[PDB]
């Protein structure tokens with residue numbers, strides 16, 4: 001029972017980051033958390049079981065885990081410890097993750113590009129790009 005989401009499954013390691021501190025500033029992350037989070041080189045583990053997608057991040061800073069069904073809102077605790085309401089959908093092969101909290105919104109898009117999993121994080125006008133490779 002293969003699914004298009006299968007392109008994302010596996011274990012991935014962070015290899016590059018751009019503009020992440022500015023993105024975190026826009027989200028409202030405090031100085032100390034930005035410094036320590038920005039140093040992290042997470043592994044991201046993506047798995048699928050039936051309709052349930054699991055994305056785990058493991059790092060020296062924090063471990064995070066979400067499980068979800070596409071299009072079905074859920075409660076998430078982010079790496080910076082926001083309590084958010086999240087909805088993840090697939091739009092043309094791109095995983096689109098919207099997080100809402102305190103009247104704010106940010107969108108995280110995840111796409112396969114060559115042998116990379118590219119993660120684009122947008123808050124207001126500020127974009128950060130984080131590139132992962134297979135571990």
Ligand SMILES: O=C(O)[C@H]1CCN(c2ccccc2)[C@H]1COc1ccccc1
Nearest residue numbers: 037040042057059061062064079080130
């Ligand atoms: O997936 C990514 O790279 C982005 C996605 C957004 N996000 C983030 C957003 C606001 C504040 C901190 C991180 C990253 C998650 O990164 C980590 C880093 C360490 C441990 C777990 C996850």
